[model samples]
Target: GDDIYKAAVEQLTEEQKNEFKAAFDIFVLGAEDGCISTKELGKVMRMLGQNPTPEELQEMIDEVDEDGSGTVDFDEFLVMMVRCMKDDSKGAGAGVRISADAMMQALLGARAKESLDLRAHLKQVKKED
Candidate 1:
């Protein structure tokens, strides 16, 4: 429903929206950097249920292609990481952050320390007919 889309958009503050747009742009642009086509972009859009316009595509390329090479190299990709991890008005409602190297260690430690944790808990039990 339209409400759902509106709600989702509303959940992001203006700055967060811009950052998300930038991240997405960087990802798509990088995917097509050496490919000379938006085939990768189309595949990503299909996976994420999005349909971008030509203007959006061009804007993405323009944003990251600082040198106008029409490509996003590793440095451009680094910009995305910086933006994603920076503070925003949206806060950490997204979730806690842990370094990738620490994530598996944290999860494994939590699982081992709390073997009876309700990680597998079901919200609803079956009703007998």
Candidate 2:
């Protein structure tokens, strides 16, 4: 269901939920049987300017494909999104002390100012949690 997404933004206000829904709709549009394929995931990664090798792409899918089904369901997709989106500039996890601004810039890639203002917001969140 929506529990995964809800938990991610549980503290969000009305305005934010509407905004989140926009992206959620886009992701769901091409899902087959309610899951996205690894091939499709590659294209989406390219949209973020990532040029992954076949092995790297497979590794990503493996991380979220709990049953080796070769497709990522909504729940798995959310976990993948959160892990990838979270700050990892320092190659560490929670309370690792990575520079939020730098991480935001890296996460933004060439779309430094084009994202839904999420890089900075999520970066800030890593610090507090």
Candidate 3:
């Protein structure tokens, strides 16, 4: 995907830029096989102010892969990220401020969900009343 910091820098405050850059670096480091999983991708979308599904991700990949390669390379990733950032920036006030905590939480949530799904188990814990 495009450098999230680069995409967000245009509108973020200095503080937000640093936070987002750190979050983006974490996200980039978590990708496997150069393609982020559907869940992680969704978190990234949410960070960018969009709610996306696995099916939606597949659709997006299809839409962006003009050559039908089934996967986006670095260049294609950048294009897609820029497109999404541009679309979200429209009708917004200096862009939304995404906190580092929120970004990290989302990434962790995605990872946990992926693990649970792969293990074919569902969490069943209850909080104290």
Candidate 4:
């Protein structure tokens, strides 16, 4: 939804990059044009034992599909990973979880920080003072 922080992504070591790419590629099976369709995404989520409705899956894709291409590319996948890593840095217990629910929560973290609607609410609270 918002801009991907390339600084953070670029900071990934060769080993880490390989690990993430391997994971991403594993789920990219049957994909073409270098993208992951919502179907593949849903399969990955289920493989992680997290079940979300079709609407929820579409919404998740909408959140991370920066190009609005109805699919998630490699860069967009990195955005999700980088966001999760930031959450992991907060503390041990707060680290990334290998589940669809956690992934969705991590993605939503971005929306909260960059959402105009939430910012508007903050404005309302201040003006009432």
Best by TM-score: 4
User: What overall lDDT goes with each candidate model?
Assistant: 0.40, 0.50, 0.50, 0.56
Q: Over the stretch 53-120, how does candidate 3's per-residue lDDT look in tens digits? A: 54446456655655434444444555566567667643222233443332433344434646657545
Number of clashing residue pairs, candidate 2: 0
Model 2 pairs in collision: none
Name the candidate, 1 or 2, with the larger TM-score value: 2
Tell me the spans in candidate 2 whose CA falls farther than 4 Å from its real position: 1-29, 87-129
Which pairs of residues clash in candidate 1, taking residues 3 or more apart in a chain or in different chains?
none
Which candidate's lDDT is highest? 4
- Estimated TM-score for each candidate: 0.28, 0.45, 0.39, 0.51
Q: Is candidate 2 or candidate 3 better by TM-score?
A: 2
lDDT of 2 by residue, 5-81 (tens): 43765555678656544554565564446565555555545444453333344455654565555566665665555
Number of clashing pairs, model 4?
0
Error of 3 at 26 (Å): 2.6
Better of 2 and 3 by lDDT: 3
Residue 98 lDDT in candidate 4 = 41
* Displacement of the residue 112 alpha carbon in candidate 2, Å: 44
